[model samples]
Target: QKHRVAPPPHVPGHLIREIDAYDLDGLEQGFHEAWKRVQQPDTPPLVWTPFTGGHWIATRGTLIDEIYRSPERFSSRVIWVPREAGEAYDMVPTKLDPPEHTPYRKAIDKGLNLAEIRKLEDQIRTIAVEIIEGFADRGHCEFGSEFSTVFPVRVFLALAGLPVEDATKLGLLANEMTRPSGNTPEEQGRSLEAANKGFFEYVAPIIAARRGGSGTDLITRILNVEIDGKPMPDDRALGLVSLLLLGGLETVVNFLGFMMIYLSRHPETVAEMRREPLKLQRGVEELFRRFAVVSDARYVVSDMEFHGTMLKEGDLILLPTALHGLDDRHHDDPMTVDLSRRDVTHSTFAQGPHRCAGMHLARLEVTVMLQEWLARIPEFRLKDRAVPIYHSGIVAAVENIPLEWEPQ
Candidate 1:
């Protein structure tokens, strides 16, 4: 009935812990219960978990940061879980490390320049306002389908030329790719593979139409860039745009939901941000720490003593930002939001060479979201009996949030 396996013989018996990153085992109990498993007093800095095809789970922030920074040992070759599904990952830059990853990362960064994205602040602000007011008069709205999901997506449309209506379809695929589910690991692998393939299938034609063309949209802009004095090939181009599509569709889409849920419960924090708008910038950083949700993976490149733990080449380790930012040892009261909090720390955008290339756009989107949202809907709370759904995986996300407010 389940895709369960015995712990790897190489792993020390004491290091083995049974925890599903997907949190399927504790879905009813919610994310806090599931993530805290790795942070338990007895959990190791790096422990072997038999779930998702038996990979190492780095529970401490320092260790996670080390893994992210030391890509030489922990390669980004295959970052998805189920080990098998990660093998199917062919995206550019993210899957590449160092000198090879440098050029492509540069190209992607060019497409996501802070100056360029800042120019879109007015555009992003309008998108956020349009989305909020579309439902502000409804007295209640499902934040995912209505706001969180669409806000960044319409921004994606402005960048990639995708229509607003396409968001639901793309978001579903992104969810399946990141938070895949099935009765067995084999089925979960297939679900993830399908989603990866689905994105490529969707992006191929767009890349084809933009090839050798002069369109200023993101796809065309990045596609026309030279990787190393040569234009990106079709395969890597597909991977690049597909990764952007997945990023544009998912990352901020989920984190912002988590942030809003937190804000909804703590109206005072929202109130403070509304009053001291400047604090919203700091608030976004702290929120990134408090609600850090991305759980990425890395493949061990060689056998080495990593903090006293023996590792084998080809081993996969899960690096969860949730664990890093929430590690009690790293932050005092990890879950509590402190708008006045300084020096926020987390790998929400990841760390080291592979840090998210699109982070500038993400920050702008979040900042604009908070500023515009609270400005209009200053008073909002979850509707009675509304139970938001959460899925934990490579990226943890709130499926929906039914919120209610005065319709004035």
Candidate 2:
């Protein structure tokens, strides 16, 4: 899938003058409009903007897939350079190249496979139900403020064998990594430092505690497992654990918020889901593909050219999950939410060697939550006049999903 190079347009006059140009006013509708214009035949080719050292933006799914699939050519080393990425320790497997990354991949894979995830099905279901049940009867509830945001923290904490009481603290730290609250480079550096420090500080003792005991939780299991004939070392083990918590918490939070709000706006879709429970699973998968909220950026390791432009080695290339997922070239009616679409493809958990390792656990958690919520509150729907606000750019999320439904 190649893109034709067009005469690059200067930054749009409207965007340059307007504040908050990157904000997605409403999730899919806004994306559909932007995508249409960018792909229009009359539109002048490609446009480039100089925000963070200026790089090309691939607004179409085909091009995004091309970049993601060819990892050897387009390495993932600097995929997330928010100015703080390099200074911090690298994420295992995610930040390493093939041979070096292989073992870390295997070690993490051994712990989060389908069989291990399936063993937690009953427990995940209980957790989902207990969460929804707390708010379903209240007549109105804010999904993000109340449940969607916090539920996954609890799940990841439990999986790490950490106490549930620390969900709030961990959640705040995770958010700082994704949505940095700092302004300057110095402030951002401090923010990243605090987040990294909090993560290691919180998990170091847990790892030590588990290594001393005989237990069967995920942390303990990782401690006991032999990676490439040796026990996982302290720093490597700690890096993996930290990555798991931060990544898991944010992904699920965004996913749940997006799907819940999406379902709220489309009642017919929700009804169809209730009638065909099996379809709901596929629906969740489709949503993840179609509504990816984060952008996966990679630094070009070497000079390359695609379409026509020269991409120098070290130039940053962003793989925007939300934008690419809805690219019409990837699927029929790419912007619409089709629960039964024949070709449902998405980069929700990414693709290739760097694809999410904890995907199975995430799927199980989402599926169980959807089933439990609908079964318990059949009349569930987004409230009238309730506009769902979403977190802005690169990281997509419904800020607050206010829902209303009758008692079962």
Candidate 3:
């Protein structure tokens, strides 16, 4: 009776579970621990949950890889649960499949390729230091509002050529689109639609003023791209900006927040990285696994048998990115963070054609943040009563981290 729907004939009754992937509540005690709720020893690798428009969830890494890579079988047309949310989500490239996304990706690569992101390192580090210094002396800061959210988000605004002062506003907007707010699919869809419309309205001036103009900024570059031998339409330009907004503002936004949360609890690793910068280089990957924070979905193209269960055309499948790294079958002590692993295992960045285009920038941000923060704040700990709040969506987040350190 709790968001339940009868399983289709091909989906046996035993495979049904009532897990709601979006409104994740409990299990937030540790880094990415919320995902362990479904990774129980007896839980099937693939199960149909009728909670969010009655979709299937894949908790294992290999299966999620297969589903992401096979876009033909599982189209990206609607990559959100309940189908309705995806219908309202119109971000360019993210909403399109392979061949169609090629041109858009081409332009995206021009802006964020390793060579390009490398050019922004000095600027990235400068912003990180600037934000850290603001509160580093106080010895206490709400990491979320002070450093975690503000730092990378300011860097994001720099790349987009937008005002850094607007980072907080834009960050909230991006987070709104990720988890959204609604008890049901249609209700959430309406909420998503309003968010999209508001973003479009905000960018209307930027696109209109920059159209047909030559500028090196990402937005101008995307605007100048000709799609299908024609200028990008207002709708397409806005959609591309929408994708840029979400990718830029949220993923790194949450990653940095969770990283701080872990560092707060285990200041030993913080000390290690401070002593040996080289170790910090490799340590970040392990943390990526421990804090993998994305859970996106794809819809089936045609009725077919998947992992011995039937999936009908248009049926949605959620790839909880957290589940992949936490699946004990692949990693020993999947719940614990082991930065010493010779080779880490994870798909924090989804596989296939759409493997996180911004991964390089994401890495650079993480590297810069850790290098700068660890250097300035030799030691820090979670503030008393500083309970981290977790939110679930396409990208999950630790909302606030009240932290304290001894003042100089």
Best by lDDT: 1
TM-scores for all candidates? Answer: 0.96, 0.87, 0.95
lDDT (Cα, tens digit) per residue for candidate 2, span 236-261: 77777788777777888887887777
Task: Report the alpha-carbon TM-score of model 3 versus the true structure.
Answer: 0.95
The 0-to-1 C-alpha lDDT of every candidate, in the order given, reads 0.83, 0.67, 0.82
* Candidate 3 lDDT score at position 135: 88
lDDT of 3: 0.82
Model 1 lowest lDDT segment of ten: 24-33
Error of 2 at 174 (Å): 0.6
TM-score-based ranking: 1, 3, 2
Which regions in candidate 2 have their CA more than 4 angstroms from the true location? 1-47, 86-89, 184-190
Tens digits of lDDT, candidate 1, 280-356: 87778888787877887999999788888998899898987788788888888888898897767888788999888
lDDT at 114 for candidate 2? Answer: 91
> What local lDDT does model 2 show for residue 366?
86
Better-scoring candidate (lDDT), 1 or 2: 1
For candidate 3, list the clashing residue pairs, or say none. Answer: none
What lDDT score goes with residue 84 in model 1? 74
